[PDB]
Amino acid sequence: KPCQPGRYQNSIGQRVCKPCDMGTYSRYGGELCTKCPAGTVASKTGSS
């Protein structure tokens, strides 16, 4: 299953999705958290 938004998983064979850090966001799936672009803000950990 893909890691639902707010999480990420940069590995193979992992059974869990790590949560995104503060100031970063991720959508469904995603191999890595995306740094939030200029002019936008991520407030909490695992921001969708």
């Binding site: 059974r15 869990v16 999705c17 790590k18 949560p19």
Partner: protein, 49 residues
């Protein structure tokens, strides 16, 4: 019967039907030789159970 696969889970999630989480490896009644329990692993029921 409960597990926390990832760190920081607010509550211990219950094991889904078909699996189980024994109190300890020593008291695990039906577990294979090489399997150990630590609280982050849900083990499926054996064949016949």
């Amino acid at each position: 019967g409960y597990y926390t696969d990832v760190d920081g889970l607010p509550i211990q999630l219950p094991c889904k039907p078909g699996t189980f989480m024994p109190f300890d490896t020593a008291t695990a009644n039906l577990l294979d030789t090489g399997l150990t329990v630590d609280g982050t692993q849900c083990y499926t029921c054996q064949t016949g159970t």
